[model samples]
Target chain A: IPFIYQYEEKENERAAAGYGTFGYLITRIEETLYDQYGVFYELYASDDPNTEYWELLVEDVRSGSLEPEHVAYIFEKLEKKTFAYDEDEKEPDYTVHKSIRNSVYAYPEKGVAFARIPYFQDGSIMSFDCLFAVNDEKMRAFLEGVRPRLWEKSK
Target chain B: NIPFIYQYEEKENERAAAGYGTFGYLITRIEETLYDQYGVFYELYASDDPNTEYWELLVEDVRSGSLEPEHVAYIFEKLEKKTFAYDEDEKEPDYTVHKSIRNSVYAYPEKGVAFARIPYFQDGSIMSFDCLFAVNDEKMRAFLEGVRPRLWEKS
Candidate 1:
């Protein structure tokens, strides 16, 4: 099942051709056993080039470079494809699958890519693997089309 | 936290299977847990001799799966009470024989199952060991004796 419906870029920052690429920073659950017994995929670079952006976002969360609400904002956007940068004056370009909420903790952005999948679960207990780099042109279109009901209020 | 446990014992029924050397069976949740829950990989090894000893049920971590914080704590707890045994025949009168019996004893976990065996030796011996551990030592001893005969009968 596709969990991410769309992705939208929030800001436009021309980093570098060699440095900038695009894809969904994904993590997901792969193979599983029983309802609560299974393995998780790791937050790894997808076959996309834009993984660096996800890494930057993740780093912002780890070093406390961003507000906790911002970290939560990124997570909400990634999970819901709500908010993102607009380099092309359109929206962010990516999509993630929907899945059970695994434990949320801070780690290297490089560690979690496009998505996080919890392969197994027993009630609230769960395990997950993160995947990243879910970027594509069509994904960008989806993100542009997405209209989140809520937006971050200026603080 | 339960380390891999393996052993073989000699018995009266089929001592002829000896010259073929010993074989081993290992039952462990660590591998299953790591592979299934954390995505960590591992390998297993057995005793070299039929009447010798088994090493530290060696388990090497390949990929350090996305282990849960609580799960990591659980592994540490197992480490705190880590139990290991080796057959040092040269140190005792019948070190090979005595160690063989000592190795048979196993600690059954509340939620998991584990067992192992080595091939039989022609010296009218079946590689076997005794259960020398438990929160209840006396009960453990009784369980060992009660199962010892059955183990011999099956092999």
Candidate 2:
């Protein structure tokens, strides 16, 4: 059968890119006939050649590891923190947290969305996260194609 | 070893059930160790016709853990002892013999997991039926009875 997508190798590890405008560095790729999970890949891009680069970590947190409350607690503290770009402003205004359950934080001005979603794994709680520069359409498409395939390795 | 119960739920537009069943099989996705320890996962399917039930248990990531080879050999031995009906015309034993059903036990000490696949005939085609204790012995035995009883009925 055709594999989900073509992947290359770097440092003797399987990696893939071309998912979006950015390139991805895949740290983990778990494949099986029954199910696949945790494509622990990294997405990165440099808009400012000399100074700034945007990077996001993408991964599946196994359901058995932690609870949704724990994830929420982590994101809660993260939201309260200030970003580097906001330091110069007299009053730093930014969207810290969105939905507590399918947690999301958006900085439309900065072009970024940090999303954390808790999902079901055989009735147990599992989750996935996406932290990216403001490009909702691209990030959404990338996740849409990749997320559900996590469970489709059975075929 | 732990008693596992199967649970079902809907998430991301897909339906799944996981739990420990009549056998020692821990069917739930609640444990990451299923992958971390055994290097495998079980895929389950349902059909409008109950007799046509489908499942796939796969073992991968032999490099991740040390418990797999011993685990695979143990299961292989159990299934071999249970081989009862021999089709004299078929010229093969239905038990632990690797080629008998496309089953083989291999130790990849370098990789970290032991690998095995128990093959069974179904509807005129050979299909893999088990993946160590990750899928459990009793479940494999039960599926054999349900899907192809002739393999044991005459013994």
Candidate 3:
């Protein structure tokens, strides 16, 4: 099996690149987690199910880089935070987290997703929060977009 | 006495499961050892009983540097007492007398772990030793023709 802590190396690279200067947390979501264990809500603020973002964030916190508030903020944006518009024919729910979560769990096998949030301490201390699950397309796209931008400064 | 004591020691202790590379290397090594030390390629049985399945072993006789039958019988007699199986079709015995070096290749195509079976018996129940040998096409045809009636009886 692949090493569980592989994301740490990647996080170190990101830190070197000046991408929020934080370590990573990551985890995996299996059908067993939902069908058997029945923990439905995605942790780490990520709507994605299979990716390593949440695991990476967890690792960062464990390593003393990421703070809980930053994790909470990332969670709020990716999971808890939602936006919507009232119906006057101009109505649309901006709460994309539900849509993202739904999309991720829909397949549950082939396509998995992850989320990452970066936090900077009062000093130069940087950290990240991340989670992953199956079939999370939106979260994947967002994370992918963020990576090049965040780490480009270092590279 | 020394040889017998060492043989007893081998029978008692060697209980390690071989990994892929080790098993593969051993196949070649065992064949060479049998051929070089003994001098004949032997008829190989997948099991100890006459009713059990069989295969052929091709070991290069280092003395003649060619396949010979004497080496075959010698190795068979030596190996039969060891524990080994040909396929999962046979029941697992306490020890393996002989095993294929390349069984791991069976796992990927079969989509799971692969297994083997080797029948064990003593006296009329089955022979103590099993042997596999390479034969010419004509020899195989003749051997099969001779054995057909017995095969029919079993079937």
Candidate 1 chain B: worst-modelled 10 consecutive residues by lDDT: B54-63
State in Å the error of residue B53, model 3.
Answer: 7.2
Error of 1 at A112 (Å): 8.6
lDDT tens digits by residue: candidate 1, A34-128: 11222233434333344444444443344445321221222332343322336786756443322213323322222222333333235653323
Q: Please identify which of the two predictions, 2 or 3, would achieve the higher TM-score against the true structure.
A: 3
Off by over 4 Å in 2: A1-98, A122-126, A133-155, B1-116, B119-155
lDDT of 2 by residue, B1-155 (tens): 78657655448545434321311232232123335445665333211122321221112212222243333222222233222234567876543222221234333332332233444445546555433322444554564455344324423
RMSD of 3: 22.1
Worst 10 residues of 1 chain A by lDDT: A27-36
Candidate 1 residues lying further than 4 Å off, grouped into runs, are A1-56, A59-114, A125-127, A131-155, B1-84, B87-155
Which residue ranges in model 3 land beyond 4 Å of their true spot? Answer: A1-94, A98-155, B1-27, B36-38, B42-139
Global lDDT of model 3: 0.33
TM-score of chain A of 1: 0.20
Candidate achieving the largest TM-score: 3
Write out fnat for all predictions, comma-separated. 0.00, 0.00, 0.00
| Residue-by-residue lDDT tens digits, candidate 2, A1-155 | 11111234466343333332122111111011012222221233222231111122122221221211122222333332222326779976554322333443333333333444344458876544545442456556645544355455235
List, residue by residue over B40-149, the lDDT tens digit for candidate 1.
43333223323221112211100122121112112111112222233365464321111121222122342122222222325445443211112334543554455546
